[model samples]
Target: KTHVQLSLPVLQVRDVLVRGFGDSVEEVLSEARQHLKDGTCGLVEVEKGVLPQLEQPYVFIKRSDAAPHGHVMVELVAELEGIQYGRSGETLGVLVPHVGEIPVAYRKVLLRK
Candidate 1:
């Protein structure tokens, strides 16, 4: 079992806490990594500019003449869209999946209207 206290301080983002049944500490991190590797976290486009206030974790600039072939790691979290002055902030957004029948843990929920 995993226990996560999602409480956060005002105007800040911080580390997560996890307490769970596992063989080793690596097990916990592995769980977190799968979460990152899971789905369409956000989108990146050639025209979208970077942030003016903070540093970006990754840098990608579009090349017009380049033969565009790619693959990359994406990560996601609730409320990850942003943190700004009166705005969670509109960054980038996208529209995608998983192993063993496409990852619907709450299948019955989706079945509802």
Candidate 2:
């Protein structure tokens, strides 16, 4: 079994980027935190902006040009060892088995959220 420990600080940073319709920021983050801690994938729709500047053991898979617009779908990951890759030799995003990879955007990361 794969063990994934979520970073609270990272989740806080995510709390800033996470987009919610009816749910409040706290509610959305709490749900995501619980889900990830339970060894399940948590989906967070991230706005196109700068990532926070914090040292955490995680990888942000960016969105590609062909990807859907609006908010970037982010799947919080603790590690990338199990994340496989395609042999096509020309793909941009990371290859996640369950949730398809959308190339993570390259943005600035300041100290503040």
Candidate 3:
């Protein structure tokens, strides 16, 4: 088994960009790769400027698995405060995930209900 850890300083909502992935698994993996190449951590949110679609929230975790049969799971628990969004133009609450969660472990939570 391998152990990974991550942390992020407090960031504003404008620092976050929400993207949409169609019903394609390939799209999901592709987006994750693009974000990783750009040094980004995926956060759960709706797609910008596209309402009435009822987008589901998901976190894009980036990691290179070298071990055999290694897997990771994420569980979001709560939200933190003091973040603002530029597109929807609203203040967002931070989203918190369970411990040992991949992508961003121990960073302030920033998700919506």
Candidate 4:
């Protein structure tokens, strides 16, 4: 058989106002070289008030139905290992509680070993 293709969901940021980038933007990114050697794959929590630098720093959004603009409401960080080749994708809109789905895209990793 040919090489295998795997999809791993990584960073997911929500309840924030991203500048320049639109409400829905899918992204595929390369991982840190060291990560492959670490053999680790799981979700990493980001510290409150501090956001990891990716693409660009995002700000909070303010609206009555929103989580109160200008505040980091949600942040996610993750990493994977043993990936010879990797790519990322994203989706905006899903099933949420009352809001239905938040208009935000996150990194979905595609890996080949």
Full-model lDDT for every candidate: 0.22, 0.28, 0.31, 0.24
Order of quality (TM-score): 3, 2, 1, 4
The residue ranges of model 4 lying beyond 4 angstroms of the native Cα positions read 1-31, 45-88, 91-113
Q: Decide which is better by lDDT, 1 or 3.
A: 3
Per-model C-alpha RMSD: 16.3, 14.5, 13.5, 16.3
In model 4, the worst 10-residue window by lDDT is 91-100
lDDT of 4 at 70: 31
Best by lDDT: 3
Residue pairs of candidate 3 with colliding backbone atoms = 80-94, 94-109, 94-110, 95-109, 95-110, 96-109
For candidate 1, lDDT tens digit of each residue in 1-113?
12121111111111112112123334423443343235311222213342322122222111122111232112222221252111222222211111222221211000000
Give the per-residue lDDT digits (tens) of candidate 3, residues 5-52.
323332323433443333344444444334433435434332464222
lDDT head-to-head 1 vs 4, winner: 4
- Give model 2's TM-score versus the native structure: 0.23
1-113: candidate 2 lDDT, tens digit per residue: 23222222222223333222113333433444454345333232234442223222223333322212332333323322343221112211211111222322332111011
lDDT at residue 95 of model 4 (Cα atoms): 13
Clashing pairs in 2: 61-104, 62-102, 62-103, 62-104, 63-102, 63-103, 63-104
- Candidate 4 collision pairs: 60-70, 61-69, 62-69
